Amino acid sequence: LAQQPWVEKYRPKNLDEVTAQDHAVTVLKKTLKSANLPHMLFYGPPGTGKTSTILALTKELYGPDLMKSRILELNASDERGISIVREKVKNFARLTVSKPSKHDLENYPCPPYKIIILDEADSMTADAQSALRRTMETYSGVTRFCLICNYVTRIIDPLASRCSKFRFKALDASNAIDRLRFISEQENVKCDDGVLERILDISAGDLRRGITLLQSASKGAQYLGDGKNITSTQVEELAGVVPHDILIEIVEKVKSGDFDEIKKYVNTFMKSGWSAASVVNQLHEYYITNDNFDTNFKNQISWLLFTTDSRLNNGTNEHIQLLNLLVKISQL
Amino acid sequence: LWVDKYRPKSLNALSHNEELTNFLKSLSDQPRDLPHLLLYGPNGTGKKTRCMALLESIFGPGVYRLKIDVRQFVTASNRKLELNVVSSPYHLEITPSDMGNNDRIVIQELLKEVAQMERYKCVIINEANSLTKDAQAALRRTMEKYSKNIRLIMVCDSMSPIIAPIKSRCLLIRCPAPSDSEISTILSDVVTNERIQLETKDILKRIAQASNGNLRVSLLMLESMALNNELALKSSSPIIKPDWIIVIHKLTRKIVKERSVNSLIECRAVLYDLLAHCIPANIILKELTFSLLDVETLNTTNKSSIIEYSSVFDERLSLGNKAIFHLEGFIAKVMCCLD
Amino acid sequence: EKNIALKPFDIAHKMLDGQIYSDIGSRNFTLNDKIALYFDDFDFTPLMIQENYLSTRPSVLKPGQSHLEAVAEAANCISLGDIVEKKIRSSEQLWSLLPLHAVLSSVYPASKVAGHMAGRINFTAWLGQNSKSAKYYRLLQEIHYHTRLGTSTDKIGLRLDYLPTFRKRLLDPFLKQGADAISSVIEVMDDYYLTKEDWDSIMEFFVGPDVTTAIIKKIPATVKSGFTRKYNSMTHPV
Amino acid sequence: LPWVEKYRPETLDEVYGQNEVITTVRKFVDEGKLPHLLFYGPPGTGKTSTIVALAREIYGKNYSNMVLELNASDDRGIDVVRNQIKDFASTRQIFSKGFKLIILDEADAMTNAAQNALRRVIERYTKNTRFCVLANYAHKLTPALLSRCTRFRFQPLPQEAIERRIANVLVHEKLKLSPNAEKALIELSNGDMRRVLNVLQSCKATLDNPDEDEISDDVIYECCGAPRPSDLKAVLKSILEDDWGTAHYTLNKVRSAKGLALIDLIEGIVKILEDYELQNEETRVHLLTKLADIEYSISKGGNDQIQGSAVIGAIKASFENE
Amino acid sequence: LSLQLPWVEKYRPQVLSDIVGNKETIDRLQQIAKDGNMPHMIISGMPGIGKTTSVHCLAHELLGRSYADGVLELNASDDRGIDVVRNQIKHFAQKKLHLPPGKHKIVILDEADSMTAGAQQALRRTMELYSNSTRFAFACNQSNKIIEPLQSRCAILRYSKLSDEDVLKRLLQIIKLEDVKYTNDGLEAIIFTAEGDMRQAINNLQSTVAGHGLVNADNVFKIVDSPHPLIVKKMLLASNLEDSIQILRTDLWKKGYSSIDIVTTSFRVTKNLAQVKESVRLEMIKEIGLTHMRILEGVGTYLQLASMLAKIHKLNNK
Numbered sequence A: 001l002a003q004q005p006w007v008e009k010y011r012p013k014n015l016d017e018v019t020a021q022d023h024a025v026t027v028l029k030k031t032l033k034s035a036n037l038p039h040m041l042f043y044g045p046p047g048t049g050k051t052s053t054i055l056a057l058t059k060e061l062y063g064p065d066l067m068k069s070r071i072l073e074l075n076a077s078d079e080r081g082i083s084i085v086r087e088k089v090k091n092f093a094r095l096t097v098s099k100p101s102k103h104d105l106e107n108y109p110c111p112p113y114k115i116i117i118l119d120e121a122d123s124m125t126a127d128a129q130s131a132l133r134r135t136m137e138t139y140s141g142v143t144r145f146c147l148i149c150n151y152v153t154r155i156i157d158p159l160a161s162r163c164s165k166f167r168f169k170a171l172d173a174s175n176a177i178d179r180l181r182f183i184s185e186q187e188n189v190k191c192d193d194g195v196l197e198r199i200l201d202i203s204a205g206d207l208r209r210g211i212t213l214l215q216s217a218s219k220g221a222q223y224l225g226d227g228k229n230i231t232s233t234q235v236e237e238l239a240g241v242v243p244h245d246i247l248i249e250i251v252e253k254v255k256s257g258d259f260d261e262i263k264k265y266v267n268t269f270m271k272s273g274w275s276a277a278s279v280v281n282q283l284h285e286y287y288i289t290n291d292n293f294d295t296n297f298k299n300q301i302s303w304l305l306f307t308t309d310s311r312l313n314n315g316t317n318e319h320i321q322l323l324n325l326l327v328k329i330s331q332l
Numbered sequence B: 001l002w003v004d005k006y007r008p009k010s011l012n013a014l015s016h017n018e019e020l021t022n023f024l025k026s027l028s029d030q031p032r033d034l035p036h037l038l039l040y041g042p043n044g045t046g047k048k049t050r051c052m053a054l055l056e057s058i059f060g061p062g063v064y065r066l067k068i069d070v071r072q073f074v075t076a077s078n079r080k081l082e083l084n085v086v087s088s089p090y091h092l093e094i095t096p097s098d099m100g101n102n103d104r105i106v107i108q109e110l111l112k113e114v115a116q117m118e119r120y121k122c123v124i125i126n127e128a129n130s131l132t133k134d135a136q137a138a139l140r141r142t143m144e145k146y147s148k149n150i151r152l153i154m155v156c157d158s159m160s161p162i163i164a165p166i167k168s169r170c171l172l173i174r175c176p177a178p179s180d181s182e183i184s185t186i187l188s189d190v191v192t193n194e195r196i197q198l199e200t201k202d203i204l205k206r207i208a209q210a211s212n213g214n215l216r217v218s219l220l221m222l223e224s225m226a227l228n229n230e231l232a233l234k235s236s237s238p239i240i241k242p243d244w245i246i247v248i249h250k251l252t253r254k255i256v257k258e259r260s261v262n263s264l265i266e267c268r269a270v271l272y273d274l275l276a277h278c279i280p281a282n283i284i285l286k287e288l289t290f291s292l293l294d295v296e297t298l299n300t301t302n303k304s305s306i307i308e309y310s311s312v313f314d315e316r317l318s319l320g321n322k323a324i325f326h327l328e329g330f331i332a333k334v335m336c337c338l339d
Numbered sequence C: 001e002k003n004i005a006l007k008p009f010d011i012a013h014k015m016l017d018g019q020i021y022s023d024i025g026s027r028n029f030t031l032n033d034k035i036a037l038y039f040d041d042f043d044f045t046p047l048m049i050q051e052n053y054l055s056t057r058p059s060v061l062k063p064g065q066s067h068l069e070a071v072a073e074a075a076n077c078i079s080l081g082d083i084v085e086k087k088i089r090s091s092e093q094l095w096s097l098l099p100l101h102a103v104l105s106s107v108y109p110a111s112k113v114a115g116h117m118a119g120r121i122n123f124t125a126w127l128g129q130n131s132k133s134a135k136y137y138r139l140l141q142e143i144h145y146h147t148r149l150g151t152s153t154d155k156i157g158l159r160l161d162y163l164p165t166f167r168k169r170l171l172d173p174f175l176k177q178g179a180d181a182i183s184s185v186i187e188v189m190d191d192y193y194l195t196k197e198d199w200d201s202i203m204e205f206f207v208g209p210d211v212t213t214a215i216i217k218k219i220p221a222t223v224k225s226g227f228t229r230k231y232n233s234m235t236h237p238v
Numbered sequence D: 001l002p003w004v005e006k007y008r009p010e011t012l013d014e015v016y017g018q019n020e021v022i023t024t025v026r027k028f029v030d031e032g033k034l035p036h037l038l039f040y041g042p043p044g045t046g047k048t049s050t051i052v053a054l055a056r057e058i059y060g061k062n063y064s065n066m067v068l069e070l071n072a073s074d075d076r077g078i079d080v081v082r083n084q085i086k087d088f089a090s091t092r093q094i095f096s097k098g099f100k101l102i103i104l105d106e107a108d109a110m111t112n113a114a115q116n117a118l119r120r121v122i123e124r125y126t127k128n129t130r131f132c133v134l135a136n137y138a139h140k141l142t143p144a145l146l147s148r149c150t151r152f153r154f155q156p157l158p159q160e161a162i163e164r165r166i167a168n169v170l171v172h173e174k175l176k177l178s179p180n181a182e183k184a185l186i187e188l189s190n191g192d193m194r195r196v197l198n199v200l201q202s203c204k205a206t207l208d209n210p211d212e213d214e215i216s217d218d219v220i221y222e223c224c225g226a227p228r229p230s231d232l233k234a235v236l237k238s239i240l241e242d243d244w245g246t247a248h249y250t251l252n253k254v255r256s257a258k259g260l261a262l263i264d265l266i267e268g269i270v271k272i273l274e275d276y277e278l279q280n281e282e283t284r285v286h287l288l289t290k291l292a293d294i295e296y297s298i299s300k301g302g303n304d305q306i307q308g309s310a311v312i313g314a315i316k317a318s319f320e321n322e
Numbered sequence E: 001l002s003l004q005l006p007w008v009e010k011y012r013p014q015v016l017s018d019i020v021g022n023k024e025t026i027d028r029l030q031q032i033a034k035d036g037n038m039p040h041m042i043i044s045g046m047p048g049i050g051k052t053t054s055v056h057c058l059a060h061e062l063l064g065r066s067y068a069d070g071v072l073e074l075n076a077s078d079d080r081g082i083d084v085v086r087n088q089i090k091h092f093a094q095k096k097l098h099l100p101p102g103k104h105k106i107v108i109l110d111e112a113d114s115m116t117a118g119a120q121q122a123l124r125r126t127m128e129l130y131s132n133s134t135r136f137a138f139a140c141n142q143s144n145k146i147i148e149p150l151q152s153r154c155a156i157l158r159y160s161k162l163s164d165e166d167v168l169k170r171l172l173q174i175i176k177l178e179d180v181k182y183t184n185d186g187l188e189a190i191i192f193t194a195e196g197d198m199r200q201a202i203n204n205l206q207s208t209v210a211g212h213g214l215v216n217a218d219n220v221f222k223i224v225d226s227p228h229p230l231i232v233k234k235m236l237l238a239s240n241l242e243d244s245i246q247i248l249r250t251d252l253w254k255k256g257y258s259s260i261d262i263v264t265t266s267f268r269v270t271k272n273l274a275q276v277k278e279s280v281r282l283e284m285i286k287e288i289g290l291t292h293m294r295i296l297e298g299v300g301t302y303l304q305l306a307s308m309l310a311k312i313h314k315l316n317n318k
């Protein structure tokens, strides 16, 4: 087949192929049984199957052929704000509804409305969501909106009231690793022990990021050409994750507490090119979930890490911020 | 200059980071399926050289037939903008951060023009980490749209300012700075090519250590030292440092020696002199901080206070507008903690 | 009319007076009056305060507080006021933050170091330095445009790393060889598409011990005349 | 039809709360006069309700031929809606009352140029048309636009009147509402009657058996998409009592499963902590300062896990002061 | 009450001697009217300081009571466009009118900052074309938005925020022109709300007179949208943090007041807290401004106000 992202390639086709989402799948099947389809609001952890399930529902509603004409997939995270997204929605709604063929009508319901899908709707501002609600109520006759978001509480009350809400449970690690293993076996990807587990850990359970990272690792293995199994260090390099050995060395340097030793180690470390934000994230993960530190140490170090992350997010010098963070922790 | 005369013009001519060279050679073996690249690492390590070497491996030596042109763009309020675009018969190089916040429209217009004019043409974006978030979103949209004819090779020093959506669509490649042995080998090759007399090879090791892994800095330092010593480097030959670094070290010694308001006024004068001659404020702050931390007379408490104030005022510089306001505050805070 | 130029000096002198910061002086001259003093000329008052707040002899020092600590606090507040000013000038609707900028840039920093003016109220030097920095950045941009093909660096890298070495190839040979180094200097300039104007501009970027004004002045006029004559007598790459 | 339109009162007798505004408006209706009016305040106070009540009391059966309602947020912008205003002002009828009436809603959501256009239009048609401007705040408008219309500030309705209206809606719609659901709805809508009616109508639709089922507070919170107090209380209890690992796990699990943003979680936890009886005031000072800093940092982006652990540490550290 | 022209224009002055704001501007305008040589002028400043009224008075002081063609006012940000406004200006300037020697026409360019560089250059060309009979006064927001070729020929008048004394002096005119029953607290409240804004002060006075007639603080702040300064003062000066938070939550946040209004009123009240040492007032103002900046960046929550109160309480109790 032609080159295609593995995220789009391995989306479930129909509702019956969505795993670990039986509650939302059942409610959506019941809604599909009814002729009227209300506005929908898909929320849950990222990479659980929101877009996959809405696409499967659309394909069951319209059929594989008519689906492309009745769907406007938009992402609300793009800049220029309300104007572009609302103008595109208005143009799609004012566009004449495509006439289904004889085959489409006899085999699929082909309802007379066109589904509009907004991704990352929670990132919209309050004014943007109010304008979206205005647009939804203006063209409510011929368009049904589906909002995909991670947090339902970020959606304003007037907009959330108009939409039936479907909660997607976070994927069990077993289900995610089984899906990744199936994808790897289908694509003939050689992996060592714990490579898929490492991919899931790096992606924090996000199956979308896990699939993307697996595809990148497969491409890197093809580039290497040796035919050997993909290793954990390769996926760590691809994801921009500092090796655990360097993190342990940083922890030991902090524990010793010498200012000059810490400064020298940070100077050496900044030459390797590892991202400082990744170091801060991994230090947070190591220290917070460690049973060898008491409550007061974690109370202080959480604020230290928060301050360092806030300063790093402002576009500052990584070397100075990392050195300050490591020096402050060594004094705890 | 020797830094430019002996720059590797091909993937075979690279001498350090062998694994990265092998990876880049494999990428050129399949030109059709070339992914978008994001190259990150310390400054002066060979990122641009490797970009050009990969381009030469794909398209041939014609990538080095570079010509420069000025493209004129217009924005909403008829503000004519000019951007310098270095072009070849095969690729383009742009630095949209030169346009400030107007980088978004420039990127959109130029990428649309290149896509319309078109197997594909590579666009190299320098200082990708300093792009605005809106510009990065526009770059992601152009990646999604014109991926058939446009392949992006972004170069940055830190990958953190890059937005997450871009990172997923690009191949992250890490360029560690060369070790001291590799820098010494490169300098040895340069001095053998230029016929420079060396009393001992330890001179090259000292130059490598003084450069702190910056290959460009080490090469330029070697050239400067050779010219000073009549093309004959001795074991007693001093390491030559740039003028601004010498000024900053003098300022550090002045701050450590005396801590008073008059000293602060004279430090203000020195900082004005440095800023007026195209020395960036962040560079001044970093050099001043790391010169202060190297003073032997200071104790642990003083150094901790210095690094904390450096972090605070680095954030304030990034969020600020007038550079001299923050550097003076940092120096004033440092003087109080030492006294 | 003609006293407009003297108005920022009067405002800076009045706001740094330590009398109006004592209890009686505060009662006679309230905080509203000080913010109004800022708003008399809001373009120059923050600059004048930042310029002149090191030249005072503080009389409002707290017990156990030195002059340097008050200066550090004033500088910290001035930095915060600069951040506020940047946020104000960004967009246009943030004019409501003008009193906050007044306090953070003019009133509060003056409160810490208020006293007797030890000398004279000097006009702000930030405007001239900003113009000088802009001019030198334009010159650096032009030089980078000329030398971009031959060098692998950005503009800042060109200033920090390349230019110190260019000095040893474009100016140092004149000191040791005289007019005999004209050919080598021209050859180096040709390799980077550097004109005589670029050669003049490059020598203006050096600071500290590397200043070239006196060194260039000490070069014999015959050497410079021969250099420019030889440059004008031959064609150059463009 | 939306329940907002269905239960909009047809006469001034059914309006509550704003006794002074009702009396002043009733004087205008009794005398048959209609001057320029400016109604402003929190949403859901009954501005449009009062104006339509007075218009239907004055004009009567010919309400459609006398008035026109407009929204400043419509797709037509400002020029096209001004053209519509001109077209309505140029309407000719066989018989008509003293003046026309045009309703402009959300006037404060327009640029100063649109306010200038409205200023230049208001006195243009005074001879045969009267203008009313609706907004959330009056001082937020440009001063010259403020002076063209009579000031009438609207204040949030008392809770007793809101409860009476909710009971009336319940008995009219044959809805069964738990008292806890009533308290949750009143707290969430904080006096906005439009929010109350919209949530009540939407909750009825979600009932598989609307004729016999009862709406619980869980249904209300699901419909509004708001953090449940029970979840926030559980998170706070885990933070205060359990160790760091348990608190971190509980916070992440709850706010990922229930889909609560970290900023909304912080807001809810702050609201809950206000009722706590703390012996030391430094506890409150540290809590407020640290939580505000974290909330500000969240708006700029940053690491989400780090911010969550920062919230946990800020809450734990402050309570060390007892 | 019947249909009345608003007092923002009904009782506008018609002579330069009856204007109190910007005494330097008054002196210069009187001198220019006496001399008869009208120069170019920039009168940019914050809105509501009555620059349009001042130039309107200046026109009829330079000339006689002639207004039909000698005085023109227009908005540079008009919906009709820059070209239409420029054409109207050219038509007015080229329109012949009986002018006394030296008494040139005056054109007021309200909101002149909207003019681009090319539009400003075209306006300069038009001014040079009609320099023998026309002069320009620019009523824009900012002087820095006007190009140097225009500014070099203008007599720079740096209009700034009016002081409370000027506001009181100007409002005394309306006070004596209207049958006002009032108390000192009411006038103090009216001056407090405007804060140097003449148009806002006049509008608030007219609204208070229309609504209640009597001018007392309670009715004035029942008219005004801003939170009552007494409530904010009680919130700020409370010796116990829980009392401050309780006052906030009950009287300000639950009353529908926006966070912006709350921080603005807190900033205004803290400036005038004469019973508190000025250093403490400066610290409190710094905290209030920090929370104001946080609100203007889009946070604007109740937690920010609570933290502001906590920091102010920490400062007060040391």
Ligand SMILES: Nc1nc2c(ncn2[C@@H]2O[C@H](COP(=O)(O)OP(=O)(O)O)[C@@H](O)[C@H]2O)c(=O)[nH]1
Pocket: B003, B004, B006, B007, B008, B013, B014, B015, B016, B042, B043, B044, B045, B046, B047, B048, B049, B050, B155, B186, B215, B216, C152, C153
């Ligand atoms: N001999 C040699 N020189 C190198 C190599 N890599 C980089 N350099 C030198 O390093 C200098 C600066 O590298 P540059 O392209 O600016 O990398 P960047 O600034 O980090 O993107 C170039 O002038 C090269 O001469 C290498 O592999 N071999």
Ligand SMILES: Nc1ncnc2c1ncn2[C@@H]1O[C@H](COP(=O)(O)OP(=O)(O)O)[C@@H](O)[C@H]1O
Pocket: A006, A007, A008, A009, A010, A011, A012, A017, A018, A019, A020, A021, A045, A046, A047, A048, A049, A050, A051, A052, A053, A148, A179, A207, A208, A211
């Ligand atoms: N329940 C599921 N069953 C099978 N695959 C899934 C499921 N959820 C996610 N995926 C995988 O994740 C990828 C895309 O995830 P997506 O549904 O876009 O995440 P999100 O829920 O954030 O929209 C698809 O390739 C799909 O194979």
Ligand SMILES: Nc1ncnc2c1ncn2[C@@H]1O[C@H](COP(=O)(O)OP(=O)(O)O)[C@@H](O)[C@H]1O
Pocket: D003, D004, D005, D006, D007, D008, D009, D014, D015, D016, D017, D018, D042, D043, D044, D045, D046, D047, D048, D049, D050, D157, D165, D193, D194, D197
């Ligand atoms: N004081 C009140 N008395 C009775 N009903 C009210 C009152 N205020 C609001 N309502 C109800 O709220 C509904 C819509 O309120 P509305 O007037 O649209 O709010 P807004 O003032 O934002 O326009 C109306 O149907 C009305 O029945």
